[PDB]
Task: inverse folding
């Protein structure tokens, strides 16, 4: 009976020697099994496979612990989802545009390219080692692993239409945002004043206006009495803020923001581009790059640099 | 134990509505209720609680939802 030596893994760091019977499929021996993203569950070992590393699902305590320590998830299917994405993302191209890793268009991935470009421009430290490592490689220009992990964490598949805001929502859960703090005040001429403090993710995201300045000055929102109260920013402690709104024509002025998302289309179906403010305004559309001194277009999300802000109100 | 509780879900325009739920039931069941009440297809939005997005397959209890918690209904873009 012919056999071969292979290694199994869930993290590609800790390897586990296995001797496999060449007359049985990988699936019969390991369960779902992947070779560099390819599903080999129904395949029998090939001679050329000797000494290769295969991903398996975390099907015992040691692998469960390794997988949790690396990915900070215990969803048993996470690895399979990651591998399926990776089988595609390893085939995408990742052009360097103005020093940032982008993604050449494939598989309706404009939203991921915009998210990735954004991530490379805001100060954010991921908690799972998987994301730290993959982000380092993606900045080195090999972003396949990072993008497949994004898809896996968001429970989206390759080819699926995506939302940038939702993607960031998923990704921030896996970031160290503990020392982020936001203080808001809401003033109603009827009801009086109520201060609120927000921490972590809720401290860096707002949906309703694109303008950080407007958020500092005040936005009108409904109160529980029915009048219009004013919500304004009292204090901000974070390395960035994200201001979001339904897509609307908005003028981006060089030097007044970090980067922004543009959505052209309709809620049901549409297209993202990325705008970044450098020496001028650069519009990145996957591999494509254009530049301009001014900008007006359908913006949905704007990111701003921050350190510490306190109102004079 | 595991008695039904009422939570709030605030839509994209700002109106909250009450929903009787049980922490044992899945996010997807709450999502069906919200779709029915708001008249928005459940593919068109995602739910968040205290910033964290709610995954359809998990039971609401996984998220520490307490009586009169407010979930936020976020209109989703398909870019
Ligand atoms: Zn009021």
Result:
């Amino acid at each position: 009976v012919r056999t071969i030596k292979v290694f199994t893994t869930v993290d590609n760091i800790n390897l586990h020697t296995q001797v496999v019977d060449m007359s049985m499929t990988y699936g019969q021996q390991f369960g779902p099994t992947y070779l560099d993203g390819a599903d080999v569950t129904k395949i029998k070992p090939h001679n050329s496979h000797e000494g290769k590393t295969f991903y398996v699902l975390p099907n015992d305590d040691t692998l469960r612990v390794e997988a949790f320590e690396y990915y900070h998830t215990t969803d048993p299917s996470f690895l399979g989802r990651y591998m399926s994405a990776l089988n595609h993302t390893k085939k995408w191209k990742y052009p360097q545009v103005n020093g940032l890793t982008s993604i050449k268009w494939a598989d309706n991935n404009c939203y991921l390219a915009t998210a990735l470009l954004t991530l490379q421009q805001i100060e954010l430290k991921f908690n799972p080692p998987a994301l730290q490592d993959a982000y380092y490689r993606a900045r080195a220009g090999e972003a396949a692993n990072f993008c497949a992990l994004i898809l896996a964490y968001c429970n989206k598949t390759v080819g699926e239409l995506g939302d940038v805001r939702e993607t960031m929502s998923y990704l921030f859960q896996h970031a160290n945002l503990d020392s982020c703090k936001r203080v808001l005040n809401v003033v109603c001429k009827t009801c009086g004043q109520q201060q609120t403090t927000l921490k972590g993710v809720e401290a860096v995201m707002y949906m309703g206006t694109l303008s950080y300045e407007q958020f500092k000055k005040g936005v009108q929102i409904p109160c529980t009495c029915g009048k219009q109260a004013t919500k304004y920013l009292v204090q901000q402690e974070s390395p960035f803020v994200m201001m979001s709104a339904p897509p609307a024509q908005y003028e981006l002025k060089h030097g007044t923001f970090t980067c922004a998302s543009e959505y052209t289309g309709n809620y049901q179906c549409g297209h993202y581009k990325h705008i970044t403010s450098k020496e001028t305004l650069y519009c990145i559309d996957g591999a494509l790059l254009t530049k301009s001194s001014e900008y007006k277009g359908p913006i949905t999300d704007v990111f701003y640099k921050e350190n510490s802000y306190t109102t004079t109100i | 134990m595991d008695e039904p509780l009422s939570i709030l879900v605030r839509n994209n325009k700002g109106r909250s509505s009450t929903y009787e739920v049980r922490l044992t039931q899945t996010v997807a069941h709450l999502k069906q209720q919200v779709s029915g009440l708001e008249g928005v297809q459940d593919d068109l939005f995602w739910l968040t609680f205290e910033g964290k997005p709610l995954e359809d397959q998990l039971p609401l209890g996984e998220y520490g939802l307490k009586p009169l918690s407010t979930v936020f209904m976020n209109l989703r873009l398909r870019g």
